[PDB]
Amino acid sequence: MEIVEYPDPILRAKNKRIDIFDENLKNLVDAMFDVMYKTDGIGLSAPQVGLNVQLMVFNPAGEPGEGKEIVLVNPKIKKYSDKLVPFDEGCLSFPGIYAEVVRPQSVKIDARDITGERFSISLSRLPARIFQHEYDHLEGVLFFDRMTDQVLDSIREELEALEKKYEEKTGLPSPERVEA
Ligand SMILES: [Zn+2]
Ligand SMILES: [Zn+2]
Numbered sequence: 001m002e003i004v005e006y007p008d009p010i011l012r013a014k015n016k017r018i019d020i021f022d023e024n025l026k027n028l029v030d031a032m033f034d035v036m037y038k039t040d041g042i043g044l045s046a047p048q049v050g051l052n053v054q055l056m057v058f059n060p061a062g063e064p065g066e067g068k069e070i071v072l073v074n075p076k077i078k079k080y081s082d083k084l085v086p087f088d089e090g091c092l093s094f095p096g097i098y099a100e101v102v103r104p105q106s107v108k109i110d111a112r113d114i115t116g117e118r119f120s121i122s123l124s125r126l127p128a129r130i131f132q133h134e135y136d137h138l139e140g141v142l143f144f145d146r147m148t149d150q151v152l153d154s155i156r157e158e159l160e161a162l163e164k165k166y167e168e169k170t171g172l173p174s175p176e177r178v179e180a
């Protein structure tokens with residue numbers, strides 16, 4: 001079972017709204033949570049485990065038996081804060097790659113829960129940073145799309161190696177290329 005790594009086109013594809021709320025959505029969200037705790041995250045979006053659907057699991061404490069298990073379906077960031085902060089972002093789809101991304105410090109979010117009802121939430125500090133990172137995945141946006149041209153330069157070669165690994169693994173052209 002798997003984290004999808006750049007340049008896999010799964011990580012760029014349209015993610016489909018969820019209209020069906022059943023045993024299946026439930027059992028997939030548990031799987032996602034458990035990968036999240038496996039890999040010590042605060043948030044995990046569906047495209048990262050290979051399903052192109054607008055589903056995210058979140059635990060703002062990001063540890064077992066702490067925080068709350070929040071399930072966000074069809075989420076929408078309504079508002080972004082106006083204060084920007086720089087933070088060293090990583091991403092499981094780019095193993096070992098970390099680099100400065102500047103982003104809004106807080107956000108507010110409408111989404112839908114596991115049975116189908118709408119809730120909203122405001123986020124700040126690490127939770128907001130992580131939520132924005134994973135929300136981007138739902139919108140087919142990767143963290144390097146957010147980096148300055150200076151900062152990307154520092155990771156271009158490490159992204160090229162991921163490109164080459166993809167071409168090795170799956171004998172085809174990397175479908176996207178940082179050199180773009
Ligand atoms: Zn669990
Ligand atoms: Zn931890």
Ligand SMILES: [Zn+2]
Pocket residue numbers: 043044045048091092134
């Ligand atoms: Zn992630």
Ligand SMILES: [Zn+2]
Pocket residue numbers: 090091092093133134137
């Ligand atoms: Zn990521």
Ligand SMILES: [Zn+2]
Pocket residue numbers: 160179
């Ligand atoms: Zn090159």
